Design a protein around this ligand. Structure first.
Ligand SMILES: [Mg+2]
Lengths: 215, 225
RNA sequence: GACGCGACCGAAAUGGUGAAGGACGGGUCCAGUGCGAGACCCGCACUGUUGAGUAGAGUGUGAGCUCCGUAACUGGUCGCGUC
């Protein structure tokens, strides 16, 4: 049987200076043949720990690993700003090698409500026969947020796609865009297009809308 | 001084073939194990293949066995991944990595290349259309306005977006692309600015999609009413 | 008692022989670990507990031992010969 490496949690939120622990649980003995890596967005992984508990040369000692039978943990004794990243365990006891699913370690800060903007489709795009309506949620925390599209007050489903940025290096917030896609024919048979946002930092849902053809 | 550089990536259709190469410098591959590891967009690392020194033994992930072949040309100090019968699920950034010296770092992978993107799809190369996201005639949501550019229907990844040839960077958010059901990508780039300058300050998004020879600039302004 | 001759015994050694399996070893087989720029292959080292088929998974005329012989001798015993 290929060896499973079950990594938890899949994400965690922590303040700078906090102690955190990440766990990887092997599905059979892997002796001590376990490594941990760090990966930042857009960049290659970097080795932190080898042989389960040995510190790789040049890695700061606030990183440590330990083995307890077939459970393995990566501990950071006190997070620094540059430690927020995704971490992967790996077993190399036998082939095929196995990576854990990864743990994203994000910065915890105070709640921030998003500012919301809606953008109608441009006249240029409409010439092409499709309309895209965009809703922007700017600089919010935490990441959980709900966007609902309404077309003449009817709730849309299955015709929108969302994208979230990485947590901001300066203010530690996220931003989100949601794009509603309609044919030109369907777009022109309705008037009121609306984006409805719920976020922890909002007492009540906030709605932004426009009327097709008016300013 | 140790570096790995992969090349050979790009677009290929389902069932097609592609050879990746991994050029070592600062060490000689004959003394090390060399591994290939891939990462699908948004997902985790998945080990692909490796080749052992002195014996040349090779090992493969079940999900690629029989289709992929790892090899090494010591006289070019280069490793290779020959990929055959490619499927859409093989779309990924492919990294090569050096397994370090046993006495120094166990079986850890101590050096990694920066990766090369392999896209397996039947969609054909296409430049994007770039549409304005115009600042609202109302005004603001908190003293400031928002505007941007919609970069729609290109293939393959990546594209770059900048504002005012790089002069404008504060409050810019360029979102990761999404893959549409058409098989084409789309993304938007937005920036928040003071509403009081919408009429006097100039705002231009710069889009570059090298695979299609498409490079455009879009001035983004308010509208009639 | 000395010497001599012989026989028997003993005997370093030795030719043949055939049982014993990990408590005789192995440059026998295997497993686990470490090392050599080395997860496997190759070499070396360590560790193994029913490691583990007794003569072969062995292209050892291996050690010890069983059984059948042979035997240096500068060992013993008995007989005989001469003082
Ligand atoms: Mg987007």
């Amino acid at each position: 049987s290929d060896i499973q490496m079950t990594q938890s949690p899949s994400s965690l939120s922590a303040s700078v200076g906090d102690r955190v622990t990440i766990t990887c649980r092997a599905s059979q003995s892997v002796s001590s043949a376990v490594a941990w890596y760090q990966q930042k967005p857009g960049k290659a992984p970097k080795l932190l720990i080898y042989s389960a508990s040995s510190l790789y040369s040049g890695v700061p000692s606030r990183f440590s690993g330990s083995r307890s039978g077939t459970d393995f943990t990566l501990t950071i004794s006190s997070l620094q700003p540059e430690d927020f990243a995704t971490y992967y365990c790996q077993q190399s006891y036998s082939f095929p090698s196995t990576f854990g699913q990864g743990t994203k370690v994000e910065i915890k800060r105070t709640v921030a409500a998003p500012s919301v903007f809606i953008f109608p489709p441009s006249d240029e795009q409409l010439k092409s026969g499709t309309a895209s309506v965009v809703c922007l949620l700017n600089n919010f925390y935490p990441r959980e947020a709900k966007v609902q599209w309404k077309v003449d007050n009817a709730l849309q489903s299955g015709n929108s796609q969302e994208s979230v940025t990485e947590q901001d290096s300066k203010d530690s917030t996220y931003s989100l865009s949601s794009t509603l896609t309609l044919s030109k024919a369907d777009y022109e048979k309705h008037k009121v297009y609306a984006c409805e946002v719920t976020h922890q930092g909002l007492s009540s849902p906030v709605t932004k809308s426009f009327n097709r053809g008016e300013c | 001084e140790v570096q790995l550089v992969e090349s050979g990536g790009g677009l290929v259709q389902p069932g097609g073939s592609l050879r990746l190469s991994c050029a070592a410098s600062g060490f000689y591959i004959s003394y090390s194990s060399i591994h290939w590891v891939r990462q699908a967009p948004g997902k985790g690392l998945e080990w692909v293949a490796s080749i052992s020194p002195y014996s040349g033994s090779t090992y493969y992930a079940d999900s690629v066995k029989g289709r992929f072949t790892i090899s090494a040309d010591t006289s070019k100090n280069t490793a290779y991944l020959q990929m055959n019968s490619l499927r859409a699920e093989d779309t990924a950034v492919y990294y090569c990595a050096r397994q370090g010296y046993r006495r120094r770092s166990g079986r850890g992978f101590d050096y990694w290349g920066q990766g090369t993107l392999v896209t397996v799809s039947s969609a054909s190369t296409k430049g994007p259309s770039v549409f304005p996201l115009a600042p609202s005639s109302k005004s603001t949501s908190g003293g400031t306005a928002a505007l941007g550019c919609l970069v729609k229907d290109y293939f393959p990844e990546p594209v770059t977006v900048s504002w005012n040839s790089g002069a404008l960077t504060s409050g810019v958010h360029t979102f990761p692309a999404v893959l549409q059901s058409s098989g084409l990508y789309s993304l938007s780039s937005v920036v928040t600015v003071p509403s009081s300058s919408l009429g006097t300050q100039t705002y231009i998004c710069n889009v570059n999609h090298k695979p299609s020879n498409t490079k455009v600039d879009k001035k983004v302004e308010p509208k009639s009413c």
